Design a protein around this nucleic acid. Sequence first.
RNA 1: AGAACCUUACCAAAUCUUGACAUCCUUUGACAACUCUAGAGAUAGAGCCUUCCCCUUCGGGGGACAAAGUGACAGGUGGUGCAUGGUUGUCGUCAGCUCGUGUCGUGAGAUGUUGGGUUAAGUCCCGCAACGAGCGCAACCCUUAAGCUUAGUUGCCAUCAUUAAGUUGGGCACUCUAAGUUGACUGCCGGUGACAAACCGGAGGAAGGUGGGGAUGACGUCAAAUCAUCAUGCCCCUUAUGAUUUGGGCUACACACGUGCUACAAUGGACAAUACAAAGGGCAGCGAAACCGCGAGGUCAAGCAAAUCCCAUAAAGUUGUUCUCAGUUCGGAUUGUAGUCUGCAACUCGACUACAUGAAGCUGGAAUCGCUAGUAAUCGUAGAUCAGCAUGCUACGGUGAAUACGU
Lengths: 102, 60, 208, 128, 84, 147
Amino acid sequence: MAKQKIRIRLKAYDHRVIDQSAEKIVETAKRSGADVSGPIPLPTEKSVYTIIRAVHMYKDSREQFEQRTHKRLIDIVNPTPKTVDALMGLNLPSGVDIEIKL
Amino acid sequence: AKTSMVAKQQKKQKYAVREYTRCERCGRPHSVYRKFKLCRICFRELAYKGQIPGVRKASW
Amino acid sequence: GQKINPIGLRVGIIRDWEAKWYAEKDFASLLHEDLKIRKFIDNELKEASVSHVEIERAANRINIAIHTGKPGMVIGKGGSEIEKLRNKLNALTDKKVHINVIEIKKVDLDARLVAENIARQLENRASFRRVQKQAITRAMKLGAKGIKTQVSGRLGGADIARAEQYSEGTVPLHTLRADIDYAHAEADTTYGKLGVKVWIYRGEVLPT
Amino acid sequence: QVEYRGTGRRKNSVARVRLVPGEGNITVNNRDVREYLPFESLILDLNQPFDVTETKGNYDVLVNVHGGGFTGQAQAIRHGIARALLEADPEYRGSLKRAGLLTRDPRMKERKKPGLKAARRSPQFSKR
Amino acid sequence: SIKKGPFVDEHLMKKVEAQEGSEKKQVIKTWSRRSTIFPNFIGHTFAVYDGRKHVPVYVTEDMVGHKLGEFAPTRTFKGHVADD
Amino acid sequence: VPKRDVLPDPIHNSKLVTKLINKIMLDGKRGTAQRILYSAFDLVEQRSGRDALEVFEEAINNIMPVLEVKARRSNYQVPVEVRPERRTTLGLRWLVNYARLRGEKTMEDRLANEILDAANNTGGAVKKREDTHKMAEANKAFAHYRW
RNA sequence: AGAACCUUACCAAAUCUUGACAUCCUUUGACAACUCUAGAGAUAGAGCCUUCCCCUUCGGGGGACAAAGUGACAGGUGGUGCAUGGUUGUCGUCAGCUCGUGUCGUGAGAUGUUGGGUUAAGUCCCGCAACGAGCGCAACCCUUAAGCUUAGUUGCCAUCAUUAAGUUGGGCACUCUAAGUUGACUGCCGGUGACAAACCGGAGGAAGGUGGGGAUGACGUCAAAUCAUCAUGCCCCUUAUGAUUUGGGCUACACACGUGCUACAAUGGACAAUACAAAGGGCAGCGAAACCGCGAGGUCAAGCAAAUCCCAUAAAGUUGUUCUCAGUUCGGAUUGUAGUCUGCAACUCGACUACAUGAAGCUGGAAUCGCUAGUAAUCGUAGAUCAGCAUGCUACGGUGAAUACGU
């Protein structure tokens, strides 16, 4: 669908750090403008790594692992160079992976 | 031995794959992941350390 | 089994990682970047006796901080040393850094420091027992709810290996809100090798 | 006119039931009940709500649904029905809760752990 | 099999060209695993390295059903007491 | 430890059908037993014109043990009444298990023959009844003065 | 959690000595590549050009090269797991095991932790020369069952219009997605019970007596396993117990053993139509459409770093036609031929399709294992390891039961 817009994606591994950071960049988004979109969730993909507790043998007693990956989705309408600075001004803390986009 | 096999899998090769992708620090080839290039035990005993991201564990 | 380390259990809830950076799925470049950091620090550890170093990593930079009981070893007199270490680091890290020393507080109650210490007295052939009783004793003055302290191997540089432990106070272990400082060590004198397994418990707290 | 609406959850499925007053004639996904179930002639059990509650019946029905086999979602049908008949009048709960049909059956599949393989069988011992 | 098409290791051909256009041998050395028969290689006496010591085999015209890649296995009697 | 019932089945209207189909369901294919049974209650009425409940209910009385044994200890064994749950469970259990043992090629002929012969007090179901009720309630003298 | 080579440790052959490789001193130097020759490669034999790049005032300094000397050296899948660290099974998630103070006893030891009652639980009350503490069970955390708020794209389309189609206008009502919080705790009622603990039943609610599950594994035991993940004491090898390479074998074959697959057919077999998932992976990788070919596959190239697009039809099932009990249109082994892809090359030893073959076998003896409800039984899907290769492993859902008299 056609519209003037900003959109980004975040990624990190902790719902608290990611959602407080979302509170930052939403606050600063509408700080310098309007028409923000909230911190829209995403399915939060996962992984798995099954390993045997072992050195030599005894495969029956296996072990697992995983790496959750939050995903967050934000949009803004009516761009301007100021909310740009709200994007590239504050990501902090920096376990996040921002990819500023249009 | 394992020491010259480090050199084996390090050098140039005649073609694409006579290779094996073994663990950086542990000299074990088997039971290795491409994502990390760490062997079986070593990823685990480091996984406990709270070093690599991340949780780990027990939700599946 | 049999037992495990708590740190891979308490992690996910009540401790962040010792290493942090962007995934992008390319880990190996950056994790095995971290791996050499994890090597070289030994040549500070030998003089410093540090607890743990973090690696935060923003986009274009690196930011770490080493937890010590001995700052003066690493800071240099008036900064003579950490710049030198940046120089010997950039040669292999091949990228910039802001190495930023951190002090850990109630400074010597910590685990890897103290485990390292008792190992140190076992390096010069101290008898085993006084090490452990004095460990727990000073620990209890400094404030704590309970400690365990262990050794393994051939004691007194002697016949077939054994293991003991002199714990005091409550050491809540199978619970899940503890925030305990587990560590481990090694030491050789003449016969095999001697490790330990320190533990503590110092009150219940979350990272938020 | 007016209709009522409650969901249906069971057995890794999801049903969005739309309860419209009518004679009773049902087309899930714009498709009749017979046209959706193999074989199946246990359909009167989806009309078990209509025998005990809104006796004898009936209301026409619309619904959309996906996920899980035919059974678990055929019985995901029931819960938005009972809930919706209680949206109408809480009168009907007393004969429902002495029959159930509303407690969204919490049971479903179970993870594995070593012993189970390509089909669900746990292992043997080494004899002789 | 083959992805279109037949082939040779192309050290074999380079040898046996000079061996063959002129008078031939009763004897050859080789490794001959990445390679095979086709009409240039008949009559000459190749010897695949069996693992211990290459054995002379003389090619025959009819070696279309059999090939060069192997003639005398590494198993070599048997390994077992009984037989076929 | 209680039973966790099966509700009705309205084809043809009764519940013993409901308990029946589940035993025939070899390897979890409930529609096949559903079909062949329901057709069995078409054909049993077709041949020997009568009601499905006449042949079915009457047979599963005729093949239904009411006295029975159990062992314990030398080799003694108590004669024992059958609970109504196990009563029908045995009727249907041995019913299908021998209905197999006829040996026809057809889905329903074997059954209609089975319960329509049982309803005539013939067939190995009835013979099983007579054997169990033979060894039972003939040696009652020794094992009866107990639970 | 991937044996053509590689891996691979083992064998034959040609090969090497600070060596395959790492640090140190000298000695230099930024580094190198393409062809010929000989060779199976390893290699060298020659052309050719690696070329003081960061800093120089003629030297120099440096990451980094260098061939040679080269003593310290290096290396050992070389032995001892009954010398060790570390790591892991097992008794067993069995419910227990221990310490202080004090008492008794000549003492070893006992006392607590015993008895009554009670529990899945050394769980808990009461009583008692015993009082307290710890480790342990429980919780504490993840996941699951319902609801409330928040947020609405790639998700959804209820109101409507439009459409191959939610594809787009519009919408966030519902579903959903992931975040915050409510709830279940003998907790409310009734009886029983030493009034107490606790047991039994009643309501409510989505969910009642640890609600299902997971993770978690006491003191210790088996001188249990591993020196071959690694680390390491001792001992041993060194012009070879170290090294490079080609080929080979780790996959043999009179036999037994164990694990698992498909069969011994009418709930069945062949053909045709037809509906319902969940979860997970894809950047030098997913391979859409269309085209060729019987087929594996091939051309071709759109979209795709992902709620977008591809993997990816889900299969079982349901409806139909035929089959009418045969070693059969049962089964699907073995063999020959013709072909597809990957890799250099599929000969030992890859996988795959097409044709033909058409094995043993018609429910299993003596003995024997699994399992108490989303379980067994049963169908298919995804992934890791990965140039190619999983009947195995892990997770994913689909259909879905009988019995539990009783100790």
